[PDB]
Design an enzyme around this catalytic site. Structure first.
Site, short mmCIF file in Angstrom:
data_model
loop_
_atom_site.label_atom_id
_atom_site.label_comp_id
_atom_site.label_asym_id
_atom_site.label_seq_id
_atom_site.Cartn_x
_atom_site.Cartn_y
_atom_site.Cartn_z
N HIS A 288 -7.18 11.82 12.74
CA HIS A 288 -6.87 13.10 12.09
C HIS A 288 -7.73 14.19 12.68
O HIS A 288 -8.76 13.91 13.27
CB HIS A 288 -7.03 13.01 10.58
N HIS B 180 -4.50 3.83 6.50
CA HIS B 180 -3.61 4.21 5.42
C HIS B 180 -3.16 3.06 4.48
O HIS B 180 -3.26 1.88 4.79
CB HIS B 180 -2.37 4.89 6.03
N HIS C 111 5.44 13.35 15.32
CA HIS C 111 4.84 12.05 15.07
C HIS C 111 5.61 10.91 15.74
O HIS C 111 6.85 10.87 15.77
CB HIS C 111 4.73 11.78 13.56
N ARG D 134 -4.81 7.74 2.06
CA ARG D 134 -5.87 7.39 2.97
C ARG D 134 -6.82 6.47 2.22
O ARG D 134 -7.53 6.91 1.29
CB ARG D 134 -6.55 8.68 3.47
N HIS E 139 -2.68 14.88 11.37
CA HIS E 139 -2.93 14.08 12.57
C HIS E 139 -3.40 14.99 13.70
O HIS E 139 -2.95 16.16 13.82
CB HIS E 139 -1.67 13.33 13.02
N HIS F 81 -4.63 6.26 12.29
CA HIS F 81 -4.57 7.51 13.02
C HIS F 81 -5.89 8.24 13.17
O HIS F 81 -6.77 8.14 12.31
CB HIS F 81 -3.62 8.51 12.35
N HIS G 95 1.81 12.36 18.43
CA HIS G 95 0.55 13.08 18.31
C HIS G 95 -0.53 12.36 19.13
O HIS G 95 -0.47 11.14 19.23
CB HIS G 95 0.09 13.09 16.83
N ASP H 23 -1.93 9.34 17.22
CA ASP H 23 -1.00 8.34 16.73
C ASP H 23 -1.30 6.93 17.28
O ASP H 23 -0.86 6.57 18.36
CB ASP H 23 0.44 8.80 17.04
#
Ligand SMILES: O=c1ccn([C@@H]2O[C@H](COP(=O)(O)O)[C@@H](O)[C@H]2O)c(=O)[nH]1
Ligand SMILES: [Cu+2]
Ligand SMILES: [Zn+2]
Ligand SMILES: [Zn+2]
Ligand SMILES: [Zn+2]
Lengths: 153, 153
Positions: free
Chosen positions: A48, A120, A71, A143, A63, A46, A80, A83
Site C-alpha cells: 500500500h 488481507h 488492479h 486489513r 495500493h 499488497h 499496481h 500487487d
C-alpha cells in the site's frame, strides 16, 4: 544487494515477518517469510502507498500505484506496482511466503521501502472478479495485519 | 517525499507519533509530534540505521551514520546523520516534539525513510559525557520505543 524487511502486526492474532532481497538495481526482488494466525485459504497480499500506521493499517492508503494502472495479479501487465497476489495459509493458519517479483523494487520510483505491506482478510481475485471493486482492490476485504517496509542489513 | 511519519511503540506503554515534513530536497526537515509514557526528563532521540524490528528495537542496529562520523548533538558538525539529540518529557510523562534539522533528509543519501526512530531510556550526552561510549551512542541506554519511518501522504 539491497535487503528490506517487514514485521506484520494487527489488532487480532495475525502476525508475520517478510524479507525482501534484490541483488541488482532493477533486478527481481525475492520475497520470503511466514505469516500465522490467518484462516485457511488465500489472503490478499499488497504493498500500500503510505508507510503510515498512525491509526493502524487503514492509514496506509490504497495500493501502491505510481503508474496509475488498474488492479491485477503479480503476473499481469495491468497491475499496481504493489500487487503481490495472495499468500496461501494451511489448516494450521500458517502461510509460508516465497515470491519473486520483477515489478516492485528496493530503489528508484518503484521503490517499496517506507511503504506498508498488508495481508488481507479474504482472497484477492487478481482483478478477475465480477464487480467494479475487483480492478481497484481485488475484493480482498479488511486489513488483518501490516507493517512498514524497512531497510535491512 | 515531502512527508514521513513514525509510530513509536514500546513497553509502558511508551507510545508516540512523530511527523516529518521537508518542503524541498535541499531544505531542512521539520519533526513534530508527541511521545507519552516516559519518565520526566531527557530521552535520547535517534534515527537508527535499519528499519528492522524483527526482534524488536535491537534489530535496528547502530545510529544512522552514512558519513562515518562520531556521535554528537544535532547542532554539532561532528555528528551522525541520525543524531537528533533529546526530547524532554514533563511530569505527566509526555514529550512534545518540535525539532528542525538540516542534516536528516527525506530523499537522497541522508534519507531516513525506511529506517528506525528510537526513543531512549536515558539522556543523550551529545558526545560530551566523559567516557568512550559517549562518542558512539551518547550513553542514552536502552531503547524504550521505536518504529519504522514511512512515507506519508
Ligand atoms: O489472472 C491471473 C492469474 C494468475 N496470476 C499469477 O500467476 C501465477 C501462476 O503462474 P504460472 O505458474 O501459471 O506461470 C499465480 O500464482 C498468480 O499469482 C496472475 O497474476 N493473474
Ligand atoms: Cu538511538
Ligand atoms: Zn490491500
Ligand atoms: Zn492493486
Ligand atoms: Zn549518534
Amino acid at each position: 544487494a539491497t535487503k528490506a524487511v517487514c514485521v506484520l502486526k494487527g489488532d487480532g492474532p495475525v502476525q508475520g515477518i517478510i524479507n525482501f532481497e534484490q541483488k541488482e538495481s532493477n533486478g527481481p526482488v525475492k520475497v520470503w517469510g511466514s505469516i500465522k494466525g490467518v484462516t485457511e485459504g488465500l489472503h490478499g497480499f499488497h504493498v500500500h502507498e503510505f508507510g503510515d500506521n498512525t491509526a493502524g493499517c487503514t492509514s496506509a492508503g490504497p495500493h501502491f500505484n505510481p503508474l496509475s494502472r488498474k488492479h491485477g495479479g503479480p503476473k499481469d501487465e495491468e497491475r499496481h506496482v504493489g500487487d503481490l497476489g495472495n499468500v496461501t495459509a494451511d489448516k494450521d493458519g500458517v502461510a509460508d511466503v516465497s515470491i519473486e517479483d520483477s515489478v516492485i523494487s528496493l530503489s528508484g520510483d518503484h521503490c517499496i521501502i517506507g511503504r506498508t505491506l498488508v495481508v488481507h482478510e479474504k482472497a484477492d481475485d487478481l482483478g478477475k472478479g465480477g464487480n467494479e471493486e475487483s480492478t481497484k482492490t481485488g475484493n480482498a476485504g479488511s486489513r488483518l495485519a501490516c507493517g512498514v517496509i524497512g531497510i535491512a542489513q
